[PDB]
Amino acid sequence: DIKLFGKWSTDDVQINDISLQDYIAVKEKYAKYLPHSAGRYAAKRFRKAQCPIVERLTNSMMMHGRNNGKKLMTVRIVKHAFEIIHLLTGENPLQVLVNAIINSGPREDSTRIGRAGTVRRQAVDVSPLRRVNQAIWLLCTGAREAAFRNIKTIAECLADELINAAKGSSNSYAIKKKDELERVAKSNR
Amino acid sequence: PGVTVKDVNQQEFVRALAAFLKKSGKLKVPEWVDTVKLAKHKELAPYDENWFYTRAASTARHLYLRGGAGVGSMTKIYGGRQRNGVMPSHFSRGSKSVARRVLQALEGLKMVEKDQDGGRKLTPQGQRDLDRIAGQVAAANKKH
Amino acid sequence: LVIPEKFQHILRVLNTNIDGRRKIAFAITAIKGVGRRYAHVVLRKADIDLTKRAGELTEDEVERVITIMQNPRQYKIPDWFLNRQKDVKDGKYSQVLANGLDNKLREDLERLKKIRAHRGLRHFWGLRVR
Amino acid sequence: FTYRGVDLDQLLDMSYEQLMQLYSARQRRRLNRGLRRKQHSLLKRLRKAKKEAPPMEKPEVVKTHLRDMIILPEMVGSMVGVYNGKTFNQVEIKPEMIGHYLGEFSITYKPVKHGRPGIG
Amino acid sequence: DKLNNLVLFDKATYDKLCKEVPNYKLITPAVVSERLKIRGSLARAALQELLSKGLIKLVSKHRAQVIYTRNT
Amino acid sequence: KVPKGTSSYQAEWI
Amino acid sequence: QSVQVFGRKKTATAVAHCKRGNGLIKVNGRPLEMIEPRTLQYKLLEPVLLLGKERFAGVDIRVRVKGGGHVAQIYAIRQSISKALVAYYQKYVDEASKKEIKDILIQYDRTLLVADPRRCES
RNA sequence: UGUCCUACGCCGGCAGGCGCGGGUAACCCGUUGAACCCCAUUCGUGAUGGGGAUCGGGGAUUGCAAUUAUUCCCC
Fold it and tell me: Where is the PTM N6-acetyllysine found along the chain (chain A)?
């Protein structure tokens, strides 16, 4: 059976959210040995949803400038994070990954509607693919912000942010950013 | 018992060849081991006190892998980034005299011989020692 | 490792404070006149292992490495690592030390003044030399 | 006074070949490359100026444009006027400047005193 | 404020090292450097010391992250 | 104060 | 009795020489597991690990590899290995078996058979 | 890319010298033996060994001439 790095199962995962079920594609056919693929996913519209979500997480955390080309390094960081998530929580790392992505994704966004000069924003609904993208982006941004100047390690930082986002506590950067975004979206109307 | 060097993990093979240079004992060791740099592109001295036999192991194994190589060729192989200061960094070769006396001390033990072509390559005794040590590393890797 | 009972937290060498919790090479580097390279060479010639810490040292090792760093030529340190190769006055291969650096730059500045060269006058005005 | 462990009288009496190790690398390279005719005439003018002088009085200045010179030990006590492109300056050659050029004894540019700026 | 880390062990530090360490599930050099304010080199050296004692299992070793797990 | 022989171009430096 | 195919990726080309052998996959005189990018060593083993150990018992593949970098290099080597297996089971083995392994390979990753057509634009 | 591009050896910490060969060029440089990247060591969140300027000494090339640092090398 296909195992992530030859160790991680992919049949035990369950998707809580119906909205993100069709775009979080890791379950049966999309399970790969390595997150690295070097296959095209931005060639045409909606093709990046077919891409495994571990590859999305890999491609989204080397985004910062001085590490903008290193991808084997990135999947090594993802490996260390997944190991320490297993030895911390005990569950499968893909399950808690799916939970963090589901609970970190925003549901309503404020958007400028009108003209230049009217700063009054209107709250609009959120696409599920954009919800997945923003969840991964916020997780990666929290991983950066927790690992700037400390002994605390970047893979360990991604693990801590992922666990904090999945259990829903107000300690992940994604959770607090999503909560303030939701409350301002409610306040806009 | 048919094994070869390329079927042996390279870093452990270099380490074991350095250990063989220990328990062999004889090699022409310079009095400047504890003062010298190792390339003009490098900033500090090598951290390991016993770098000379490790570098000799790397030189011998690269000579086995590809022959017809001179001192300048090994100097080019051991190059890397010259941090040019605030200036943009470039590529720089290694130290000429260090690799030259490594080659001279390595042929001083009758492992390496001079080519008529102009280059320099390995003795049959050298390849016998190399695939013997490759045999020991293979035995210590496939059984551990 | 273990708890060293004879630990010197702050050292005083050549009228200079040394942080004893730092590594021996970089604690010796911390004083003026010697960097990491000459510290590594003087430590390799002093037969002292690099791993152990500055406060985790005995007094004989400290005084003997001071003795090595005082007179490099007698202890087989070759004549290209030295700070001043050929002095104007006596031309002696010697290390310069912390207060020695201040005094030697002061007298170099003074001789550049009294010669009235371009470099001395540029230092007098206080502008860029190179 | 003592230069590189050697006093002035020995340096004046020191022969021509062994100054090629008692100088800096730039001066040793320049002396290896060889001196040309103009400063050879300058050096002979220095000799004629130093012998044709009263013992108590200072020898007369010789004016020159050559700032390419390295200073030899024969030139101590000499009264040399050096051009900087506009005017000559009067320099007495002390013996502690022996490892220098004449070009640093005539600065070709004035120091900058910044005034109040105009419409920039 | 600056963070003060002791480079060498104390008696209370050694007591917390020999006893309070192997019930922390995850073991990194970073967490040992963080919880009781010691330098990372000292925490690492104590970590291979406890490994050579045979008291803590190793999960993986690398240049950046080296992860261990408490016994049984 | 000015030295004996120096020119005004160099006396501006002093 | 033997076939010679190639695998291209950007600039890197790896020529696979496939012969009825004794179950050895040799890449430039080195086996698959002892290629340097050990972080990306699973991609080189994906045909071998995914397709099983079973009918690779009598296949000797010698891969002579030139050009490219490291990632494009190992991708070219793995695509050459897959194409060598497809070509050998097309030529000397029945049609349905090679159709089956092609179906499995395309079902896993499309680049295992066809090369990436995009390259460095001037 | 090349009649200044360099192969090889020796003397060399080191820029570089010395004796020798090829190339007016898919041939010799040159399987152009690159660098990030990878794999092991040490450093461990502080103006730190990060970052390297600005200065002080020597050495070697380039050039009729390097002084107003040409350039590079060693502390």
Answer: 32
D47 CB-to-strand H distance under 7 Å: no
Cα(A157)–Cα(A81) distance, rounded to whole angstroms?
A: 8
Domains delineated in chain A? 5-188 (1.10.455.10)
φ/ψ of D64, rounded to 5, equals -155, 155
B7–G contact, CB cutoff 8 A: yes
Angle between helices B51-65 and B124-142 (to 10 degrees): 110
Among D36, D8, D35, which Cα is nearest to D22's?
A: D8
Helix ranges (H only) for chain E are 11-18, 29-35, 40-52
Find out whether A131 and A109 touch, Cβ atoms under 8 Å.
no
CB C65 within 8 A of CB C52: no
Dmax (CA) for chain A in angstroms is 58
Which nucleotide lies at the shortest CA–C1' distance from C101?
Answer: H56
Domain extent, residue G115, equals 1-122
Q: Are G39 and G47 in contact (CB under 8 A)?
A: no
Q: From the CA of B80, how many Å to the C1' of H8?
A: 23
The total number of structural domains in chain G stands at 1
Domain E3-72 annotated CATH 1.20.1540.10: no
| Residue A157 CB-density burial (10 A; 0-12 exposed, 13-18 middle, 19+ buried) | buried
For residue A169, give both structure tokens. Answer: 């506590």
Token pair, residue D103, equals 């070009």
Residue written as token pair 């893909």: A94
Calculate the angstrom distance between C1' of H8 and CA of B82. 26
Helix H or strand E segment including F9: helix F8-11
Residues on chain C touching B49 (C-beta within 8 angstroms): 44
Nearest to E64 by CA among G73, C71, A17, A80: A80
Query: Which residues, in sequence order, are CB contacts of A2 under 8 Å at separation 6+?
Result: A10, A31, A32, A33, G50
Strand H close to C86 by CB, under 7 A? yes
Q: Which two tokens stand for residue B117?
A: 């072509």
Distance CA C90, CA C108 (A): 14
Question: What residues contact C7, with CB distance under 8 A and at least 6 apart?
Answer: C20, C55, C56, E8
> A81 with A139: CB under 8 angstroms?
no
Structure resolution, Å: 3.3
Q: Which of residues 84-103 of D touch strand H (CB under 7 A)?
A: 84, 99-103
- Chain centroid offset of residue D34 CA: 17
Spatial distance between the Cα atoms of C14 and C26, rounded to a whole number of angstroms = 16
Range of the domain at C60: 10-75
